[PDB]
Design a protein around this nucleic acid. Structure first.
Ligand SMILES: NC(=O)c1ccc[n+]([C@@H]2O[C@H](COP(=O)(O)O)[C@@H](O)[C@H]2O)c1
Ligand SMILES: NC(=O)c1ccc[n+]([C@@H]2O[C@H](COP(=O)(O)O)[C@@H](O)[C@H]2O)c1
Ligand SMILES: [Mg+2]
Ligand SMILES: [Mg+2]
Ligand SMILES: [Mg+2]
Ligand SMILES: [Mg+2]
Ligand SMILES: [Mg+2]
Ligand SMILES: [Mg+2]
Ligand SMILES: [Mg+2]
Ligand SMILES: [Mg+2]
Ligand SMILES: [Mg+2]
Ligand SMILES: [Mg+2]
Ligand SMILES: [Mg+2]
Ligand SMILES: [Mg+2]
Ligand SMILES: [Mg+2]
Ligand SMILES: [Mg+2]
Ligand SMILES: [Mg+2]
Ligand SMILES: [Mg+2]
Lengths: 91, 94, 95, 97, 92
RNA sequence: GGAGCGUUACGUCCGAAAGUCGCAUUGCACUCCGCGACACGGCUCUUUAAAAACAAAAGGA
RNA sequence: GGAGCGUUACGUCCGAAAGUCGCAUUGCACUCCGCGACACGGCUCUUUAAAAACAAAAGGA
């Protein structure tokens, strides 16, 4: 809701495989700043969702609302801030 | 409907026969009903395969209808009927 | 009853009528080929010809050996009944 | 003025590689020309008339204009295509006899 | 990783192997001597092909020049082919 | 309602063919041919037989 | 038993389990993990992966 190092993306094409998605997401979000990591899981609870962990918050914000709705594998991205800090960031 | 007119409208004619040949072939088989004033033929898109026959009298035409309906003509069976309007006619011959 | 006079052509019946023509015609060729050159196999599902086939051999000895070796052989759950053809097949009389 | 060439739903292609069997040539032509719109037929012949040449008959005349403009000089079997609108139906029937 | 061989995908899959090869030659011969075109319609190769050029020069020009080129109504991706080992595994 | 249209499944050929389930049949042929039954969206036209498009969620090889 | 063989339906192509369909699921983690399906006669060899052949009563498009 409130800014954070890590952006929460959902409404993602659930049929892309974990590895292709990460690299696709990397290509289009790396222009915004350094990506620490992208978490992807094809869980029931976690499919269609990604967490991109930026090094700097400013990179996250700039990415969040400039890529909002970006068409990606034929579905518009919905991007919001993660409600908690990612583990790597709060350690 | 289609009120008796001295002009008859004919179609299902073969379209390969030349205008002028078709014209006098029609003249021969239709003169035995009355004195033709004119026969209107053309192979435009909308007059090919069809013709108008104009006698002096309406009796001539009403008789050529019934006598010559289905008549085999260059291997096709003629389809005759009365002209609808002296307008439709002038509108087929552009 | 049966036709015992040797002929180039054997007449099988008691065949399974549910079998399709060219499966039967080719299953027959698979089980009879080893007796000699087969000139033709004739199958017909018509009313009076279903259930039954003619296998034409080049040599009467093939036919005899085929008739004798295969009598009663179980075939699509029916044992073939085999006899000789009452008359020659046309392919034959030419020659 | 110089007159604008009259469009046609059929395009005349030449400077084609004559070493290609005519039935492959059609199929390869369909591969690069179906994007511009529906093809109704492709005309090739082994007669000396049609040597190195073909006609691609489109449904819509707009499609032949896009294909003529987009694929002019396109290299095809290592030989650049020369494309023009076909003239008449009677012209095609002559070279296809 | 520039290489003798290009890997084409997003190819129309409702086309027969023999024709696909001959059509891919008609459009790629311009760039160099094609040593072979590898097509197959297996679940693993369908919609894809390998084109092998004598020289790496030719695969580079082909990859850039023919990128997205519309072909059987579909625009092709041309990527560089991986290793000979990867290729032999995709054919079967 | 009735006719005409057989275009369409991967994508061809059929749809007056075929296949399938019944019922009959133990039968000697060389060209076929027992009986019964079991699909199809749409578009024309209006007792006529033409016109020109067209479906795999509907049948068979 | 186990490997290799994908030839076959009208008759072409296919017949990938680190995979593929189908159904569910819009879900805030830092993590294995929703549910349901994936047919096939036979040949050949015997932990080798070669070699020639081959079925629609068995799966697709
Ligand atoms: N579309 C056509 O050209 C065409 C022609 C004949 C039959 N059919 C189909 O066959 C079915 C039975 O045809 P009829 O009702 O014309 O005998 C129709 O309902 C129609 O679906 C279609
Ligand atoms: N005849 C062949 O060349 C061939 C090859 C592969 C599979 N098959 C069929 O596929 C089935 C499954 O085969 P596998 O036992 O090789 O998985 C076999 O039982 C066989 O029916 C046949
Ligand atoms: Mg993308
Ligand atoms: Mg058996
Ligand atoms: Mg189709
Ligand atoms: Mg058809
Ligand atoms: Mg009918
Ligand atoms: Mg209907
Ligand atoms: Mg049926
Ligand atoms: Mg059949
Ligand atoms: Mg054993
Ligand atoms: Mg196969
Ligand atoms: Mg067929
Ligand atoms: Mg067959
Ligand atoms: Mg599962
Ligand atoms: Mg064998
Ligand atoms: Mg078998
Ligand atoms: Mg398919």
């Amino acid at each position: 809701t409130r800014p954070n190092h890590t952006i929460y993306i959902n409404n993602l094409n659930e049929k892309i495989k974990k590895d292709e998605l990460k690299k696709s997401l990397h290509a289009i979000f790396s222009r915004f700043g350094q990506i620490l990591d992208i978490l992807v899981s094809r869980s029931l609870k976690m499919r269609g969702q990604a967490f991109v962990i930026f090094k700097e918050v400013s990179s996250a914000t700039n990415a969040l609302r400039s890529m909002q709705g970006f068409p990606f594998y034929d579905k518009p991205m919905r991007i919001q801030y993660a409600k908690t800090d990612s583990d790597i960031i709060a350690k």
